[PDB]
A paper describes a structure:
In Gram-positive bacteria, the McsB protein arginine kinase is central to protein quality control, labeling aberrant molecules for degradation by the ClpCP protease. McsB is a prominent member of the specialized bacterial kinases and has the unique activity of phosphorylating arginine residues. On a molecular level, the McsB kinase is composed of a specialized phospho-transferase scaffold for arginine phosphorylation and a dimerization domain aligning two subunits. Aside from this regulatory role, the phosphoarginine (pArg) mark introduced by McsB has a broader function in the cell, serving as a degradation tag that directs client proteins to the ClpC:ClpP protease.
We obtained crystals diffracting to 2.5 Å resolution, revealing the atomic structure of the McsBBS octamer. The octameric particle represents a tetramer of dimers, with each dimer resembling the reported McsBGS structure in its subunit contacts, domain arrangement and active site organization. The four McsBBS dimers form a molecular cage having the length of one dimer, 110 Å, and a diameter of 80 Å. The phosphorylation chamber has well-defined entrance gates with openings of approximately 25 Å. Potential substrates have to pass the entrance gates in order to reach the active sites, which are buried within the inner chamber. Octamer formation proceeds along the extended edge of the brick-shaped McsB dimer, where two clusters of polar residues enclose a small hydrophobic core. Strikingly, the electron density revealed that Arg194 is phosphorylated at a terminal amine of its guanidinium group. The pArg194 phospho-guanidinium group is accommodated in a complementarily charged pocket of a neighboring dimer. In the McsBBS octamer, Arg337*, Arg341*, and Ser285* of the molecular neighbor closely interact with the pArg194 phosphoryl group, whereas Asp338* tightly binds to the positively charged nitrogen of the pArg guanidinium function. It assembles into a self-compartmentalized kinase stabilized by the auto-phosphorylated residue pArg194.
Residue numbers in the entry:
A (entry chain A), C (entry chain A): -1 to 211, 215 to 363
B (entry chain D): 1 to 211, 215 to 354
The structure:
């Protein structure tokens, strides 16, 4: 574990991702992803070990320890220098894909603030990821373009004038651009409306998946599925428009259940807080259920004195990889449920004692 | 009206005292049934006769006192509001049948240790209620009250049969003893259903609280008493309860050692429900209070008194909750006010 | 516990009941019961404590320590001198009824060999019971008449010339005689035939009950239900005839399943022996199931080297009252299942080591 690997696996929620983005009650994050390949180098499907090593080596040489103004310094993490639990944490923080952990010459060039993650030797040689809190696809696209320009200064992209950027996936040819949004939709699930919505979203060339990428914790990721022939601007508007609708529909449904079944909803969310604050065993499944309830309670003003950032942190912190990393070494499922309960209840008791004791001074 | 204190407090100060084995045995009850010689049983008595029985107690007993028990006061069932009558049932001071008797009454000791029901199934029902496991002391108190009443009353007796009661089974001593026991471990470990039939073979009967086994609270009483002496009736129950106390404690210790973390999770989750819910029924309330009580008993839950739980067990009953709130309440309204009451009482203790 | 009470609660199977009676593969025991009342004494329903005490006292005075030639010495046990577990054992050995344990002045005059049990102050003042192993109702009736003559020498029975012996139950008036047979009918249960038989038995004025008096262990007690107007000889023939039919039908059904499903039946009974010989926990319910299977295996020659007397003993010995008595004090159900398993497996391992080691010498 290098000092920079420790830096990226240490915190479940980066300071970058703790910032308040627009519509952050419904949209947790926005992701922009640009795929490219080296000109004259065979796509990862048919390239040699030597080729893959050169891609990583060229990045360590020209981009490691280098900087972009306004984004910060970039550090290169090689998958081969990371223990299995270290790699899982990077997955659970949404910094790398699961498939990157299986790539023998996989690596990722990460900005120190964790806003930019350039995956190397995944499905394409280069996958630039920009991750913003809340709803900011245009802002994420700008950062993506800065990193893209930065890399193209020293890398010649597989490009042709009639097809655009050449990618391994034939559908991906063109912009290499994929946009996804992470959304918390507890009211649309609760009111039994989401299963009549998802089929409509899939009609618009988008795809809906759970947090992993079933929808535990009522968290849904909506991303571009069809991009062949679309411009960058069309790709981002196709997702933006659907997300903005979902923001409105999820808000209306929250206001609806709050107005019609106020006490039942308070009972639901405080009972879930009750579980999190007193349980001695809890699985990931139930944790996700309860965290969703409490987050809905916070958003509606029912659950008081608890910030949403604590909940975002626990959603990552209670994942099985991160929980084992944080506890030091692998753990049986039963042991995890005991450690998870202790971590959640202690983190929660801590947040209500700060809120008790700093509020008391005033 | 000193009726107010009999309806206002859920747990009498008398019942807050620690009695023996109070972790398993919540209370001990001794009940003596008698009838007036030459007055027909309540099954066939006249309005005039029933009214005289109540009047005699008002004249010669109400405002009178017993040394070591304190002053007694008469409550007439016909002078008590419907919810007041319900609170007395929920506090275990009077039976449901008494609230239905038009000439019913109860002469209550001020400390709430003694409740003499008048004009129920018999003309006189003497009951003594002690906290914990103390049948013998409760029997002494009952005989003291019995002697007191017999100074001015001639009991329906028959040389070949003993005290005459309405129910033919109760003829003889008129005595029924009862214990209220909290048996969560024998329920959890799926043993109570193989215990109850053995209890029933010994001439006892087992019932739920207030007369399903809600709250894991079991009432064990003498069912067969015909031909038995006072000493045999009390010991038959004492020996079975003593065995149950031991078995429930062993079952608790076993769970504490084999499933420590699961037991803490069960009781703290129930504490979580009680302190954070916004609606709760009587049923779930009892479930959770049983879990917290077991946690207190085993030392898992700290800083919370079992007396607070005993009090909540009464305060959350529907009659007491309506009395406490000042008017009748729909079941849904009760569940909202019950949750708020439980929530508030738990928060105050934790400060 | 008196030296004579210890004598009666010590053994689960008396030497008297270990003898081989006729048809002992199907019929475990025969019972004859004669009810009488004292002339001029109110039936137990309306008698006084004084009256009941005199009945017991007259019996202690004139019958305690007394004898009948050919039956033996009689000992009087007062229910009030017996602990609750002591009384239950006497029930589980079939010596007294459950209701006698609830009678305040109940007692029983027992012969030392346990063939005769005269219950006192139950439903009638006197209930003479004669219990024989196997199928011997006429033999049991003769012993019943000997005890009846014996008691009438010093007791004047409630009798009138037009109704006969006067008993509390109005149906019982006449002979006061009730005859029952304990039968093991595993094949008729196994072949799903017994539920089409019991309704026919109930038509003939008989009644069918489990071992207690559902049919755990496939053991059924068939007794006289209707006796008003019947002579003694008619009462005994009504039961004898039905029992003799059941003996034949149960034997034919055993021969049938043995012939058609030989290996399946051997697997069934040896698997049940397997449970009894190796289990560390077992309830009464499963014990009864397995003991029935093994007994059927012994009877058919499938299960070798194990005598039926060991099984009869275990059927009583594993009852909850006797198991607690044998172990000293009451026991939680869980503790019983552990002690029961140990008792059965050890008794069984003991019987196969005698059979191993005394057979080896020859
Ligand atoms: Mg570009
Ligand atoms: Mg008295
Ligand atoms: Mg005769």
């Amino acid at each position: 574990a290098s000092m920079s690997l420790k830096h990226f696996i240490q915190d479940a929620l980066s300071s970058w991702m703790k910032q308040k983005g627009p519509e952050s009650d419904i949209v947790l994050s926005s992701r922009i992803r640009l795929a490219r390949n080296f000109e004259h180098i065979r796509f990862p499907t048919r390239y040699s070990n030597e080729e893959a090593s050169s891609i990583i080596q060229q990045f360590e040489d020209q981009f490691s320890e280098q900087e972009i103004p306004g984004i910060g310094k970039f550090v290169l993490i090689r998958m081969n220098d990371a223990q299995p639990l270290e790699k899982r944490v990077l997955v659970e923080k949404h910094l790398i894909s699961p498939n990157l952990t299986e790539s023998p010459f996989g690596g990722c060039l990460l900005s120190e603030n964790e806003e930019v993650s350039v995956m190397l030797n995944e499905e394409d040689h280069i996958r630039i990821q920009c991750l913003f809190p809340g709803f900011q696809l245009l802002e994420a696209m700008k950062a993506a373009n800065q990193v893209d320009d930065w890399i193209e200064e020293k890398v010649d992209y597989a490009f042709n004038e009639q097809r655009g950027y050449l990618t391994s996936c034939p559908t991906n040819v063109g912009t290499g651009l994929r946009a996804s949004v992470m959304m918390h939709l507890p009211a649309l699930v609760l009111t039994r409306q989401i299963n009549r919505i998802i089929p409509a979203i899939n009609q618009l060339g988008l795809v809906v998946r759970g947090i992993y990428g079933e929808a535990v914790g009522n968290i849904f990721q909506i991303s571009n599925q069809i991009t062949l022939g679309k411009s960058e601007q069309d790709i981002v508007e196709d997702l933006n428009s659907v997300a903005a609708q979902l923001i409105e529909q999820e808000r209306s449904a929250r206001e609806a259940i709050y107005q019609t079944s106020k006490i039942e909803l308070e009972d639901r969310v405080y009972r879930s807080y009750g579980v999190l604050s007193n349980c001695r065993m809890i699985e990931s499944k139930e944790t996700a259920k309860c965290l969703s309830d409490v987050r809905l309670g916070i958003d509606l003003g029912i659950i008081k004195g608890l910030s949403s950032n604590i909940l975002n942190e626990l959603m990552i912190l209670t994942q099985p990889g991160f929980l084992q990393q944080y506890s030091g070494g692998a753990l049986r499922p039963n042991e995890r449920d005991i450690r998870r309960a202790a971590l959640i209840r202690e983190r929660l008791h801590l947040e209500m004692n700060g809120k008790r004791q700093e509020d008391e001074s005033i």
